[PDB]
């Protein structure tokens, strides 16, 4: 846990690697969300289309008299309508139990990933600013040192020489104190990048754990849902096949003749 | 069997009723053939469409590393491709085991129905021709009788009167023999309509028996076929759900970090 974050904080570009893992995870959830939604749409079209013809087949068959397997085919057409109804309900429940919690967790992970990336750019910008301020302060001290040296070659003129040496020495000491304070400030920003390093990778690991928790949960519910839908098929056809056994050819024409 | 044909041959319009039953039967098989064919087309579109996205989902997922439930989703996408393949094969077998033998028996029944209708029109036309010939022969005899009477009111003139009476009497006897032969011919055509009556209804009953034999057979094979297709679903989803049990959230990110 805390050991994993350290393995990654030791790696130069661990933050970027962790942030890249989060990008990849979100695209993966995005692709999985898009495939299920496209599949659901195709199944809605299938239910809608097969239910149109099955209903038309029902209206038609129920106006017929003494037709062979008329009741079997009425049941068969009705079974198709029930499957259609089950399909539409399954799609609606999938949009609710799968699409919504996964989509919600994904957008949450994307909002946090985008935030952490900006934070990471900010802390690195602050470090480059501290290094650049330090390079200026170093070059400033070189100049003040050069200045002091120029006033250090070797009584009205003596007092003046001493004054100019003392002033250049004060400016060389202040530019020394400044460049040294810049070293410290750059060291401070360096320790700050290490606080950010741990903070970003630990949060990215906790968010991925959470995402994986939602993904397993909604996948398990999806399988249970589609499993329940797949159960309705075999018993139906075996029952319809069993209904064929007491049918005798010509019995319906014989009923027709007797009715006439 | 032969008793049913008699019940119908006693009924005025039994032939027409039997021929109408055959028309209705063919339209019923036609509607059942059209519904299965339309349904099969919708299922082909469904297989084709879902197999496009499932393949694209496969190409995509197999390029990913350390993604949660990556193997589960590869299996899930692959299952969808297998169902698609099974659907296309089921449609092809339905066109072969259901559509073709039912369509072939239907067109056979329609070719025989159309023949029997023409035969029935022909035998009835022959009867109307015999009745119309009889009505003419009856009116002809009335005229010849009137003629004879006119030559029967009451020696050169006597011999002539006797000759004209004898000739009108010969013509009245020949027109009598003709109208009587027309009664017999109409009676003959009447017995001929009764031969046609039995022949047409017995053949229509045997054709309907045959049609019912093909319909039960191909329906039973259809149910067995679709029953076999419906079996592939439940075990698949319960297995996919079982695969979720050894998955631990964050394990893949942990593998990712260790690989980096």
Curated annotation (Swiss-Prot), chains A, B:
<feature type="domain" description="F-BAR">
    <location>
        <begin position="2"/>
        <end position="252"/>
    </location>
</feature>
<feature type="region of interest" description="Disordered">
    <location>
        <begin position="145"/>
        <end position="171"/>
    </location>
</feature>
<protein>
    <recommendedName>
        <fullName>GEM-interacting protein</fullName>
    </recommendedName>
</protein>
<comment type="function">
    <text>Stimulates, in vitro and in vivo, the GTPase activity of RhoA.</text>
</comment>
<comment type="subunit">
    <text>Interacts with GEM through its N-terminal.</text>
</comment>
<feature type="modified residue" description="Phosphoserine">
    <location>
        <position position="152"/>
    </location>
</feature>
């Amino acid at each position: 846990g805390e050991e994993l974050d350290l393995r990654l904080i030791r790696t130069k570009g661990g933050v970027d690697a962790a942030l890249e893992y989060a990008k990849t995870w979100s695209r993966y959830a995005k692709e999985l969300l898009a495939w299920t939604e496209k599949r659901a749409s195709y199944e809605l079209e299938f239910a809608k289309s097969t239910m149109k013809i099955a209903e038309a087949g029902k209206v038609s068959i129920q106006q017929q008299s003494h037709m062979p397997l008329q009741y079997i085919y009425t049941l068969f057409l009705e079974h198709d309508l029930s499957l259609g109804t089950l399909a539409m309900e399954t799609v609606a429940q999938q949009k609710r139990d799968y699409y919504q919690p996964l989509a919600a967790k994904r957008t949450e992970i994307e909002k946090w990933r985008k935030e952490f990336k900006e934070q990471w750019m900010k802390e690195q910008k602050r470090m480059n600013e501290a290094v650049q301020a330090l390079r200026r302060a170093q070059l400033q001290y070189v100049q003040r040192s050069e200045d002091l040296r120029a006033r250090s070659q070797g009584s009205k003129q003596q007092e003046r020489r001493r004054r100019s040496r003392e002033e250049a020495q004060a400016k060389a000491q202040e530019a020394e104190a400044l460049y040294q304070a810049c070293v410290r400030e750059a060291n401070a920003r360096q320790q700050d990048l290490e606080i950010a390093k741990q903070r970003i990778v630990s949060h990215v690991r906790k968010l991925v754990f959470q995402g994986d928790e939602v993904l397993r949960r909604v996948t398990l519910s999806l399988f249970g849902l589609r499993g329940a839908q797949a159960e309705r098929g075999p018993r139906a056809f075996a029952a319809l096949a069993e209904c064929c056994a007491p049918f005798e050819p010509g019995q319906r024409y014989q009923e027709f003749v007797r009715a006439l």
